Design a protein around this nucleic acid. Sequence first.
DNA 1: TTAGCGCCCCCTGCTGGTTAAATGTGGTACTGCAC
DNA 2: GTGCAGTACCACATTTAACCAGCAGGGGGCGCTAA
Length: 260
Amino acid sequence: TRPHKCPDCDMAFVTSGELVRHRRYKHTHEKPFKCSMCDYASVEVSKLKRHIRSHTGERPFQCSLCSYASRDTYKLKRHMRTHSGEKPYECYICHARFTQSGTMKMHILQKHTENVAKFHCPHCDTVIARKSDLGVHLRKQHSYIEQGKKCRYCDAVFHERYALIQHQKSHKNEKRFKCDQCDYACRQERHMIMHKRTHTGEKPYACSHCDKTFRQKQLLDMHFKRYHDPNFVPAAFVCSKCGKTFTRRNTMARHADNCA
DNA sequence: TTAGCGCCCCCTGCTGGTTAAATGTGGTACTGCAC
DNA sequence: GTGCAGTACCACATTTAACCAGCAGGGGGCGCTAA
Ligand code: NA
Ligand SMILES: [Zn+2]
Ligand SMILES: [Zn+2]
Ligand SMILES: [Zn+2]
Ligand SMILES: [Zn+2]
Ligand SMILES: [Zn+2]
Ligand SMILES: [Zn+2]
Ligand SMILES: [Zn+2]
Ligand SMILES: [Zn+2]
Ligand SMILES: [Zn+2]
């Protein structure tokens, strides 16, 4: 009937030894047995054996099915879920099941809640929900590169990926390709190739039904659709007021605006 | 009494598969101008 | 009007990194009994 009770708090214990351990755990905060490697100490001998095992790497119990030996029996019991499945914990909202309690708690925090505090990157403006995801973001974007990484479009060298990407975003309104015979410039290589074809007079695309050649693919396509396709009729736009037909809509719109 | 043991949890952190935002590609209309 | 020459949409395919559940390591609390 739990005759022994702790006067310092609400806990009541059966035996004297249990109550003494409880006082040491939560009321005296003194640990007699101390780790020899560091300042860590343990009230219970098993806890100190835990730290000594971590200090030395001793793995007592081996998994039956795999190549993992745990240093604590509970770690092996948790590792056995890898083979059995057996997701014990269940979310109370979406009823999803998880192999670990911390996995379920993180799921509830990040999937079923709105005003959750997030982590801000100390080096950039991004805001990340998880600390582990922030560490991944730091370890890739803000990681230092000893050999550097050249810009894709200029001779600038950067050692942080975030800096390189920010610099490369400044070239998105730029016409890298420049013709060697005039001042014309463009952003895609195909346009530069077309312009050099016009400069040289080359007409690579040739009509297979006539003697006419063209410097661009679309010009040949429209020529074939006009003078080699009887079923094609040019789009005619009649004026809104006068009704005069215009092949180009822009001329029709301008005429309608100036029409009386 | 006291250590061994079992259970159970919390806290922290890394990791690949998923996915959504960002960005590059290319087909195809689409206008300005000289004829 | 038209063909040439250059520009402009934009659906689509990569590219990229946050999202997220699956994992393991380090520690703390108690409730049993045997020894
Ligand atoms: Na262009
Ligand atoms: Zn107490
Ligand atoms: Zn230690
Ligand atoms: Zn195993
Ligand atoms: Zn849920
Ligand atoms: Zn950042
Ligand atoms: Zn650059
Ligand atoms: Zn040129
Ligand atoms: Zn033809
Ligand atoms: Zn008119």
